[PDB]
From a paper:
Macrophage migration inhibitory factor (MIF) is expressed at high levels in various inflammatory diseases and cancer. Macrophage migration inhibitory factor promotes directional cell migration (or chemotaxis) of various cell types 2, 3, 4. Unlike canonical cytokines and chemokines, a trimeric MIF molecule has three tautomerase active sites at the trimer interfaces 23. Although the enzymatic activity is vestigial, there is accumulating evidence that the active site is important for receptor binding 24, 25.
To structurally verify the proposal for the inhibition of p110γ and p101 expression, we co‐crystallized 1, 2 and 12 with MIF. 1 occupies the bottom half of the catalytic pocket, whereas 2 occupies the upper half. The solvent‐exposed ring structures of 2 and 12 point towards different directions. This suggests that the ring structure of 2 interferes the most with MIF receptor binding with the surrounding residues because 12 is less inhibitory than 2 against the biological activities of MIF. In fact, the solvent‐exposed ring structure of ISO‐1 and 2 are well overlaid. The phenol ring of Tyr36 was moved from the original position (magenta) as shown in 1‐bound structure to a slightly open position (green) in 2‐bound structure, and to the fully open position (light pink) in 12‐bound structure. In contrast, MIF:ISO‐1, MIF:1 and MIF:2 show relatively increased B‐factors (>10 Å2, >30 Å2, and >25 Å2 respectively) for the L2 loop. As MIF:1, MIF:2 and MIF:ISO‐1 inhibited MIF‐induced leucocyte migration and increased B‐factors in L2, it is likely that structural stability of L2 is the critical structural determinant for the chemoattractant activity of MIF. Pro1 attached to 1 revealed the longest displacement (1.9 Å) followed by 4‐IPP (1.1 Å), 2 (0.8 Å), 12 (0.5 Å) and ISO‐1 (0.4 Å). The displacements are 1.1 Å for 1, 0.6 Å for 4‐IPP, 0.6 Å for 2 and 0.5 Å for ISO‐1 and 0.2 Å for 12.
Author numbering:
A (entry chain A), C (entry chain C): 1 to 114
B (entry chain B): 1 to 113
């Protein structure tokens, strides 16, 4: 599972430890070992949401399985909460795209996960 | 709907109100209110198109529905037109990936659609 | 075909010619003229892989066709190979998401490829 956050919050507003927190929390939420989890945060972005440049985020969570109606609702509560607490972004200014990847469509270690 | 542009055009070349035009231009085409449109522009990128570092863009438009053959054609003419007009990028140096998102696969405001 | 690499390796560590090498190698690997190939490298990223900030990459390869189990394994060997050789990223610290795009879902030159 791979989590990417793109935001207009500045770099200095991203707390030390945020990447590890995401890692740990996603390992709890996906039930995957943290060794398999990748996280990526992109601050200082030129973005708008509803026409406004107030703090906002555009995110993606890719996983091989563990994607679904209820699961995605749970992930959205978790990740919006983290973005709200740590980056001071309102949950109604976050979008998170979920992608259920086929194992054959994820490369790693000179091959794929098929 | 969410539109993302990545481009090698420099930041200084992105004019005032660019994000704002995108958002308005986009509300119209999709049948969505501006309130909900998200836009993202990423200048100063290290990219090539056709092996050339002349101005170019790689973009994504995500929507829950309102994606299809004719619609994507129309969006393409719209967005290529703006990128050409505002960022001086030739239309034949732009790629736009369209994604029809399932509502259950879009999160927002602690839940999904 | 479109290849994107997001990495925490710094800009100065991306060697001269890398965008051209990627373009050339993907032309050979996909069977597609170089004029159709787009490449994008994003250094200096705030990333973690497996709860570590050692060099890593998160990548995507989009193609209209030319995507599948054996092809993707081949692409992963090639692309991890380049990332290890040129950017000193270990292949087990790379993910590559593969996307088989429908022609009607790729815009270009005021229209789509459909």
């Amino acid at each position: 599972p791979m989590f990417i956050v793109n935001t207009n919050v500045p770099r200095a507003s991203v707390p030390d430890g945020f990447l590890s927190e995401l890692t740990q929390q996603l390992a709890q939420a996906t039930g995957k070992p943290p060794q398999y989890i990748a996280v990526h945060v992109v601050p200082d972005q030129l973005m708008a949401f509803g026409g406004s440049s107030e703090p906002c985020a555009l995110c993606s969570l890719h996983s091989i399985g563990k994607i679904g109606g209820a699961q995605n609702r749970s992930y959205s509560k978790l990740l919006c909460g983290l973005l709200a607490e740590r980056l001071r972004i309102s949950p109604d200014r976050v979008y998170i795209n979920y992608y259920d990847m086929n194992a054959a469509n994820v490369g790693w270690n000179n091959s794929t996960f098929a």
